[PDB]
Structure 1
């Protein structure tokens, strides 16, 4: 059973026994499918549960099978799982062929109809639209170069640049107006890919390249699509420098797209060259520069599903060994996290294992002995190991290295801002990146401060959302007063530095201590001169706060008055609740967090008319297993834990609590033991999983809130 369909090598042996016991039940296989795949979360099945119609993702995007496979005809679990994989690969290939045909139809066109482009984007998945855009652009550039092959001829490459420019303008226009979130992410991926294509085309124009075999064009990633080939898996040939690989054709759902900085392209080139010479790469460097996500992006672009072995105290071996032999079997990639954090014995053992598999890979240029089993090495297999300065002695001769010394933050911010529809993106990025550089060093050091690159990306996304809210509000006001509605007409008039300052104030000021606020305001004055942001006070909320504080005997003050700081803190808490579904009111005991959120809840109930219900839960008083729920060793019955019980009661909507506002205040200390299960909740997914396998979606009204005293032991994640 284990050898056939090696994709369940990654799931646990106990989970293997569970899936064997649950063989005649497809409804309980969803967790395993989440585990072994990349972004696949559930298989779409009919009401009968005899044939699988298609696959879906965590976000909700789904793929439909051209020829669905019936489980009844092939009852064996491994047999129809292999059929599912093969049919998913074939369907992705065929949809990619359709999408490239479409994009070349809109390709080589003077003008682009926004309606047709939006319909095309909605028709196909994000990975497929990005891949089709890349294929079409690469083929167009290759054809234009071939026309230039005569030597000093007329330049059709300017036509390619103009087409990319008008497509980018269309995307920038489209992203500005309100869109569904999935189509929003699709647009963002498409526009960052097109920005990279535009920049590389500009470089090609500047270099006056005239030959299709010139190394200047060879260095950039080229996509070759061959619709005539019979084998669907080999249809797409991704080729860059000397190395050339086939597309993995595995579903990725929707993934964050890296901006392709010049250093990112350097990492791409180095890893690809290492893989061509049949040895892995070791992108060492300080933490926080996107090494592991660089490897993830390289794998995703190739269509290969990558493993992130987070190496900390949670790291294991027996599971590590079986998932490693599975990686060897399937051919998927595996990217280790920080390797220097292992125990010396631990590090030596994994080093010997990876040395053995790497020797097998070089021999393939074929089986290797893993757990006393000879394992055929797939040529597509690749392993990447990242340091935080070194590599063990048995691996130095076996692995290439690269310096992840510092990412190009300016280009990262410029591309991300341009993806949000911001105009003058380059100026804003060149201002904001040094601003965070100043923040990281001039501000007083604290444990909860985070001025990293992820902070930049989060702040920039929040700024984009703030701009969208402002344009929607102005559109509503224009509908009320007058009728002349034009998105661009408000767009170019609308200031944008104010929006960035508002976003950074709304996201960053709350984390500041009482002393750091003047320093932050001075930094905004220095980097963004003359421009200031004043938060629009919510007068109705202020009156409700006054009335509730009077009713609860609390003190009230505005600004410099007694209680002003507390009121501003409550207002910032309200804003974070508005823009986030997860909160942590960190502060010393005796600061007033509890009844601050209490008065905010009561004022919100008395203003908006939505009844407020709070469920105060202490995480440390009760044990983690009882907090989340017990797993029955024999019947697998679900004795829902306290938090799980509250969530299920809220979800069931027995007494209309969905219409009510629910705040799950987690008063008590926080440590990375119970919060690991809640980590899947505080992300944008907003799903909660259970050890039995049931997964629950979080209603929009529920707001997870942490009331903790200090963050000496809370992980930065």
Structure 2
């Protein structure tokens, strides 16, 4: 407290002097203790007990004196009860730096997000909203003349209320002219709307309408003619026509929101006036009394008693609280009933309890009623993130300032919090009931309640609302103090109709009656998905987007006509314009990216059912389409338009682009191997080539590192701050050391999403676009930065994170097997296998690589191989049918298409490398295409069997071999009773049994059963060949099988057989974490700062380090089902590197491999590996050797 702000010492000089004296004594004592830290030595210090007791007494006195000072400051300015002790100390302590107070005005006030100071920052000219709307004080508050924070802040609040009252008086005086008129000039009306604040505009129009109807009903009674009421309705309709004409035009966002609020108001006013139908002729009839009426009395000296809002019996006063630009609600009959019930409860001094299913507008209706009365409503979310310790302070604040308090879902609280908050609500509500007691002296009414163990005065204007969700009921103590209301079915049709009318749609009613049942259909006919949201909020967002689409079409037509010689008329353009097509376009553009492959046909079927004959045509994007095609050609990817191959992938990348345009945070939640990474990389490169803005991506696996290593941490002992990986990246971009802003920065995460590492990201993904650090820094998200999540699923993701982010679902149908086959063939025909660093950058340096067709003999050999493989890699090619059969077969691991396909491609690469080594060993006789063909066809069959049935048992390997034999024409071995997988393809096209390659070794007398002797058998040599194949391409080969089969010994023997190979055994267990791999890298490797970047390479040059991880399955999953070390290995094998937790820099691996062994995942203690990890690993089922192999070995 006394070393955080210098002004705290000035506020409390006696206490500062006292603490300085104590601190001196305490530091001397602690030095004495540090000299002799033994507990017996400390206990033997002379008079230590008495000194510590005296220090405890004095320190308690200062802490109390400080608490009393804080309580006095809170009592002087009751709104300070809404900020904590640290925030309050910041507010009073930072008196000179007024600009530090602007971050707390949102907690204290309703719509006041900041205050506008003078040039010298000594005079508060006015207040400002979060949107930007400002209210200039009639008489500005002078901080210099009132230096105390409480004094000038109270003057700011009082001048807020007085200004609002005076501006409302002026606005009402102006709008009475429009009310008493038959033709409102659009320009004058828009000028009036621009002049006054949104809440004052809506309130003035409400006051004018209430005054007119009141006068009319009296006139109707005497005259006997309904003419006055008809005139009121006419005027409302004329003003509504003017508002519609204005809202079709192009308006500023603030004026647009004001127009929408005014339209929502006037629709309700016209409805009420039409309800002329019931033939009311008296102003005291309940058909008029039940309506909320506004009686403005400008002559009243007290601003809080100038405007009266009366509904039925109840009669409140406008609190004149600046609400900023709030979201007005469509005044449906359900909301009318809510207003009536809550006002009746408030007049009866009872609280309100709207109950119903979530999303029915309960807390929104409570907040809207509070804002209609000019009150400050605080909504307390009763989820797990509930401030229990602050509840008493906030309750005292509500009682003292006369603010409203709404609980989002009071039944979500746990039993202890529920009971305590119920007791507090009960005492406050009993105090409120005390105000309806006539015996209590009205002249002097100090009604108080027992809050925070003190008598807190309760203002009559405050109220408590308890929104509940049945399935349950109010606590037994609050049942008799609260009036319940069933808000169970919002009138979505009228909400949609009024919002569509406010967006300029002429056929608002038809479109509403279409779009509400359609959203019901989608919510009940689309696959149960967590990211699906067809509620009222989503419907409102869709309607707003449809209005935006309508206005952009209008602007496009207007610009086209301006370019031509044709005249321009906004209303004419709006009339000759399809509203249904715009609504369907908005619905599709909002929902299709989130849809799984099965739900798109369903969505379009339900759509056609509701909208018959209306077709959705996707926007044409020829420039980006051609850039995408060029990038896909460059990256060997497959491109297609519409129904062509790659069409779904291209439409997915276009959807991802539109989501990047709309949102700043977004997710790709397709399954593994569905084209997410290629989609966003190709989009980044296409945008780079199209817009000319450089694109940089920061793939940050959030689970390979801890939360502290991701967001940074500060030492509590020394207050030393460390930047985490994400914070370091964000700060780098914000620093703009190398003009980072001038470049498109995408922060991709590429890891599982859980409600632990995204909590700090919630404010970044929200509209705030701000990262709050435990240090206290507030890092603003730059406009170019795009936070991107590439995930497999959303099983362990919060609805908050899903809602804050755009959604693009990459169903596995997006990526076709033909597309992967084409990619493999193009890469084989283009990229030479033998060439490493050379001819790798030459691919980028050459746009078409003219004159480099015969780059190497390797390239020619693999091009000839691709030619022979081409026929088999067709839509109905042997590979496809075999892959379908592979899916039919059961496997030791969860089968994925890309695991098998990658294993097959690596085996084919090894086949062409074998052709190359044969050519090198026989310069005189190159392998003629004749033999090459036979060999490649046979090796293709071999690779298909060993890649699709590698996980399968011997029976299923035989089944796949028989299926291949049935469905192929290549010459398979003619063995009567020997499996095809028992044969090797030699260099020549002929097969050769594996048993021929098995030698007959002899073991010495000792070491007879040594743990390093491996007797060569058919399984041993076969698996060793597979290891050599898949380790030539440095894949994370995994052998799985029952215990005792020989996985560990075969792996170790084969790895040690390789000369340039350092084998490191890393036994995994449930306690295994990535720090084990980091320790292994520290022990066996070194980091070198190459010009490209940090490279982690083995200390021994010219040798590849293999990390034999003996039990891949064992590492335990989190409570969200994720093995952190497995994710680390996946990152290091996919992205080829990781991130140092000390430097926050990318470290690229060099000459480092991974090999794993497992027991079947069905065994106890073994967890199934993630599909994003299994995609890269080739898994082989090492079954028991069998009678012949056992016979040979033993």
1:246, CA displacement in angstroms? 0.7
Contact 1:39 1:253 in 2 (8 A): yes
Quick one: structure 1 residues 564 and 441, their matched pair in 2 at CA, closer, same or farther if it must change by over 3 Å?
same
1:660, CA displacement in angstroms? 3.4
Q: Within 1, Cα distance between the matches of 2:718 and 2:505? A: 55
1:587, CA displacement in angstroms? 1.9
1:578, CA displacement in angstroms? 2.5
Greater mean deviation of Cα atoms: 587-596 or 126-135: 587-596
Contact 1:687 1:695 in 2 (8 A): yes
Deviations 1:63-94 (A, max 9, x none): 11111111121111111111111111111111
Quick one: structure 1 residues 168 and 664, their matched pair in 2 at CA, closer, same or farther if it must change by over 3 Å?
farther
1:639, CA displacement in angstroms? 6.2
Quick one: structure 1 residues 631 and 473, their matched pair in 2 at CA, closer, same or farther if it must change by over 3 Å?
farther
Partner of residue 404, structure 2:
333
Q: Within 2, Cα distance between the matches of 1:524 and 1:384? A: 40
1:241, CA displacement in angstroms? 0.7
RMSD, matched Cα: 2.2
SS at structure 2 position matched to 1:66: strand
Return the match for 1:580 from 656, 663, 666. Answer: 663
Contact 1:282 1:384 in 2 (8 A): yes
SS at structure 1 position matched to 2:230: helix
1:211, CA displacement in angstroms? 0.4
Contact 1:364 1:377 in 2 (8 A): no
1:300, CA displacement in angstroms? 0.8
Quick one: structure 1 residues 227 and 642, their matched pair in 2 at CA, closer, same or farther if it must change by over 3 Å?
farther
Quick one: structure 1 residues 132 and 699, their matched pair in 2 at CA, closer, same or farther if it must change by over 3 Å?
farther
Partner of residue 454, structure 2:
373
Greater mean deviation of Cα atoms: 265-274 or 595-604: 595-604
Contact 1:31 1:693 in 2 (8 A): no
Q: Within 1, Cα distance between the matches of 2:724 and 2:91? A: 24
Deviations 1:423-446 (A, max 9, x none): 110000001100011111112211
Q: Within 1, Cα distance between the matches of 2:96 and 2:718? A: 16
Q: Within 2, Cα distance between the matches of 1:546 and 1:707? A: 23
Greater mean deviation of Cα atoms: 516-525 or 2-11: 2-11
Contact 1:281 1:400 in 2 (8 A): yes
Q: Within 1, Cα distance between the matches of 2:77 and 2:226? A: 54
1:264, CA displacement in angstroms? 0.5
Greater mean deviation of Cα atoms: 447-456 or 583-592: 583-592
1:700, CA displacement in angstroms? 4.1
Q: Within 1, Cα distance between the matches of 2:719 and 2:579? A: 55
Q: Within 2, Cα distance between the matches of 1:713 and 1:699? A: 28
1:149, CA displacement in angstroms? 2.1
Deviations 1:166-204 (A, max 9, x none): 11111111111221111111111111111111111111x
SS at structure 2 position matched to 1:597: helix
Contact 1:151 1:210 in 2 (8 A): no
- Greater relative CO, 1 or 2 (CA 8 Å, sep 6+): 1
Quick one: structure 1 residues 9 and 656, their matched pair in 2 at CA, closer, same or farther if it must change by over 3 Å?
same
Q: Within 1, Cα distance between the matches of 2:777 and 2:668? A: 30
Deviations 1:265-300 (A, max 9, x none): 000000000000001011111111110111010111
Partner of residue 606, structure 1:
689
1:35, CA displacement in angstroms? 1.4
Q: Within 2, Cα distance between the matches of 1:583 and 1:211? A: 58
Contact 1:44 1:55 in 2 (8 A): yes
Greater mean deviation of Cα atoms: 43-52 or 640-649: 640-649
Quick one: structure 1 residues 348 and 443, their matched pair in 2 at CA, closer, same or farther if it must change by over 3 Å?
same
Q: Within 2, Cα distance between the matches of 1:82 and 1:636? A: 36
Structure with bigger gyration radius = 2
Deviations 1:579-609 (A, max 9, x none): 3333222122222222311211111121122
Quick one: structure 1 residues 323 and 698, their matched pair in 2 at CA, closer, same or farther if it must change by over 3 Å?
same
1:629, CA displacement in angstroms? 5.6
Quick one: structure 1 residues 431 and 235, their matched pair in 2 at CA, closer, same or farther if it must change by over 3 Å?
same
Q: Within 1, Cα distance between the matches of 2:756 and 2:117? A: 35
Quick one: structure 1 residues 628 and 290, their matched pair in 2 at CA, closer, same or farther if it must change by over 3 Å?
farther
1:128, CA displacement in angstroms? 1.0
1:57, CA displacement in angstroms? 1.3
1:11, CA displacement in angstroms? 1.1
1:659, CA displacement in angstroms? 4.3
Quick one: structure 1 residues 129 and 655, their matched pair in 2 at CA, closer, same or farther if it must change by over 3 Å?
farther
Contact 1:629 1:639 in 2 (8 A): yes
Q: Within 2, Cα distance between the matches of 1:394 and 1:414? A: 41
Structure 1 position 167 matched with structure 2 position 239:
yes
Greater mean deviation of Cα atoms: 410-419 or 605-614: 605-614
Quick one: structure 1 residues 649 and 472, their matched pair in 2 at CA, closer, same or farther if it must change by over 3 Å?
farther
Q: Within 2, Cα distance between the matches of 1:319 and 1:622? A: 34
SS at structure 2 position matched to 1:233: helix
1:23, CA displacement in angstroms? 2.9
SS at structure 2 position matched to 1:206: coil
Query: Which runs of no fewer than 5 residues in structure 1 stay unpaired?
Result: none
Partner of residue 348, structure 2:
277
1:577, CA displacement in angstroms? 2.1
Contact 1:9 1:323 in 2 (8 A): yes
Contact 1:40 1:251 in 2 (8 A): yes
Contact 1:28 1:693 in 2 (8 A): no
Greater mean deviation of Cα atoms: 92-101 or 265-274: 92-101
SS at structure 2 position matched to 1:237: strand
SS at structure 2 position matched to 1:259: coil
Greater mean deviation of Cα atoms: 35-44 or 495-504: 35-44
Partner of residue 758, structure 2:
675
Q: Within 1, Cα distance between the matches of 2:732 and 2:314? A: 55
Greater mean deviation of Cα atoms: 639-648 or 458-467: 639-648
Q: Within 1, Cα distance between the matches of 2:497 and 2:279? A: 26
1:575, CA displacement in angstroms? 1.9
SS at structure 2 position matched to 1:65: strand
Quick one: structure 1 residues 248 and 599, their matched pair in 2 at CA, closer, same or farther if it must change by over 3 Å?
same
Q: Within 1, Cα distance between the matches of 2:597 and 2:277? A: 52
Contact 1:58 1:685 in 2 (8 A): no
Contact 1:59 1:685 in 2 (8 A): no
Structure 1 position 687 matched with structure 2 position 778:
no
Structure 1 position 460 matched with structure 2 position 531:
no
TM-score, structure 1 as length reference: 0.95
Quick one: structure 1 residues 192 and 695, their matched pair in 2 at CA, closer, same or farther if it must change by over 3 Å?
farther
Structure 1 position 53 matched with structure 2 position 125:
yes
Quick one: structure 1 residues 101 and 517, their matched pair in 2 at CA, closer, same or farther if it must change by over 3 Å?
same
1:483, CA displacement in angstroms? 3.1
SS at structure 2 position matched to 1:393: coil
1:17, CA displacement in angstroms? 2.4
Partner of residue 428, structure 1:
511
Structure 1 position 239 matched with structure 2 position 305:
no
Quick one: structure 1 residues 220 and 581, their matched pair in 2 at CA, closer, same or farther if it must change by over 3 Å?
same
Partner of residue 650, structure 1:
733
Quick one: structure 1 residues 51 and 507, their matched pair in 2 at CA, closer, same or farther if it must change by over 3 Å?
same
Query: Which runs of no fewer than 5 residues in structure 2 stay unpaired?
Result: 1-72, 438-447, 800-1194
